[PDB]
């Protein structure tokens, strides 16, 4: 999908290192996890590593823009149930009626909102750390038809 | 001081908003606090606000680069005692002998390290939140002769 044709929102979901999980701070080597999307069925996530937090975020954004997927959305929800599995993360995603909300943990909620989903039920069945939730939610999204 | 003549390191000290103090995350309006410096007596800090964390950090960096000060350092420490006061923050800074370390809380340690100080004793006498520690440490640094 060509990123440059899309107006993409960029969220920072996790930032690691100093007292390990900072979500954004200072001193020695850092990695950021970023999810970007256009609220209209196009999301991507990326990872970046550098000695400074701003560079690691800039690199995570360039990476996400290269890993953009397109997701089918019907109304405000997804066309059918799906189970994402990536590494230690595994998440069940189900259609919900207009009015439910994105019932999901924050890293997963980031991915769902930037894809443009507004009502969905999700059940985490594995690691709840950000990298695992994000990569498994992604995996689920890629399976929709 | 002209920023473009200096190789400046950029640290992110605080990021605010969603469940208020994120230090770096996702959803609605964000402010970042950034300290930049060259480890050779030039530090500046800045603040940025935007709906996305990367823009608020980019803006905090442009602001810090406009607010660069120059600090006298003798060896690895500061020439004399000083008390910074800005708002609810107040911090005492004292010379320490080679071998002490930057004995300071993290937001203050960020400012001292990027200025290039390596041994100093500091005693916080006020608000310990990042914006207060940073702006008061700054104030102290500006008083050195």
């Amino acid at each position: 999908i060509n990123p440059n044709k899309l107006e993409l929102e960029e969220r920072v979901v996790a930032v690691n290192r100093v007292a390990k999980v900072v979500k954004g701070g200072r001193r020695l080597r850092f990695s950021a996890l970023v999810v970007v999307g256009d609220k209209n069925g196009h999301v991507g996530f990326g990872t970046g590593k550098a000695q400074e937090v701003p560079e690691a975020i800039r690199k995570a954004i360039e990476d996400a823009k290269k890993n953009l997927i397109e997701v089918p959305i019907v109304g405000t929800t997804i066309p059918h149930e799906v189970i994402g599995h990536f590494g230690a993360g595994e998440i069940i995603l189900k259609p919900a009626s207009e009015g439910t909300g994105v019932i999901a943990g924050g890293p997963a909620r980031a991915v769902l909102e930037l894809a443009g989903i507004s009502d969905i039920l999700s059940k985490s069945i594995g690691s709840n750390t950000p990298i695992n939730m994000v990569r498994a939610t992604f995996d689920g999204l890629k399976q929709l038809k």
Side-chain angles (χ1 to χ4, degrees), chain A:
Chain A
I1 291 164
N2 169 23
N4 289 52
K5 286 185 168 77
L6 303 168
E7 227 70 74
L8 295 183
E9 180 174 344
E10 312 161 346
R11 301 202 196 169
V12 179
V13 178
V15 180
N16 286 344
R17 232 222 231 62
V18 152
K20 296 315 247 84
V21 36
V22 294
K23 276 187 185 183
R26 62 284 163 201
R27 287 166 288 293
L28 223 273
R29 190 107 213 295
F30 300 82
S31 49
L33 171 60
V34 162
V35 180
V36 298
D38 66 350
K39 294 166 300 297
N40 189 225
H42 297 103
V43 256
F45 70 98
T47 273
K49 308 202 168 190
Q51 150 73 235
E52 287 180 29
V53 184
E55 259 277 298
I57 296 176
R58 172 184 317 155
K59 277 150 67 169
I61 294 173
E62 281 198 287
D63 194 66
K65 281 175 183 175
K66 284 165 189 51
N67 300 345
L68 241 38
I69 61 177
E70 194 183 297
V71 174
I73 287 139
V74 183
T76 55
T77 197
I78 54 162
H80 60 264
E81 314 209 1
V82 93
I83 299 171
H85 314 259
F86 192 108
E90 180 173 38
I91 194 172
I92 302 141
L93 306 170
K94 296 162 170 285
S97 53
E98 198 296 287
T100 309
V102 177
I103 300 312
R109 190 176 194 219
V111 187
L112 269 12
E113 294 185 335
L114 288 187
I117 292 152
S118 307
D119 296 294
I120 191 167
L121 277 143
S122 64
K123 197 212 182 306
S124 202
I125 281 315
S127 196
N128 294 335
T129 58
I131 354 301
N132 290 315
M133 283 193 85
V134 167
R135 291 216 248 74
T137 295
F138 235 80
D139 189 71
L141 287 188
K142 273 164 80 170
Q143 284 171 61
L144 260 3
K145 291 285 79 68

